[PDB]
């Protein structure tokens, strides 16, 4: 349900 993303977002 939560947002994830590429690690460069921090």
């Amino acid at each position: 349900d939560r947002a994830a993303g590429q690690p460069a977002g921090n």
Partner: antibody
Amino acid sequence: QLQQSGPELVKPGASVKISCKASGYSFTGYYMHWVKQSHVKSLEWIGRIDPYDGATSYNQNFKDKASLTVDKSSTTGFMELHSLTSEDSAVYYCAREGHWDGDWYFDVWGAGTTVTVSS
Amino acid sequence: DIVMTQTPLSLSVTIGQPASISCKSSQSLLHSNGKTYLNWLQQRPGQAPKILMYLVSKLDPGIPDRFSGSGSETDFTLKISRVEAEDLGVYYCLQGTYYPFTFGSGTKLEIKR
């Protein structure tokens, strides 16, 4: 799927707030990012925001220059730029970090907002 | 900040001919989880950037299969098997492994006819 606000003329030292309206997907489930384009050969990541709880992550270059917020009721993201200088004249994009095949990438982009800093 | 270098600066390719673009990162983009977060973007004039490929080699579902990607952990290549008219624009690599995100210099592709 992402609609940005219109072009802005800003006096140097003033501030501006631009918006990114989302539609057609679960707003709180995906990060909203902002990107600065000073010209055709420059792209810079400004920061991201989690619309679920408003948590933000910023590029160190844009801390104290930018601040990201969301309004969940209208499914809109906002970026406010503070105390602008001529180096802040650029085109500003919002993007959704989408999900496909279990992997994450910027799959939807706004059309861009032109900000011109001038007296 | 990771420095992303693209070569060539500009490229001129005839319709139906192959095209090749390279990207170099100042550090290895292999992350602890085993994923190499390297993206290729295309920006047509007057339009927003568009992700073509992510994770070095994976195409976005709406991108034609004439695009392909290869690379190691620091050196990457975007290939167009047969260039078409809609492929003009500026191509950027974007690294997503190390904070913050950093884009490449950009490579201009002109279509020869």
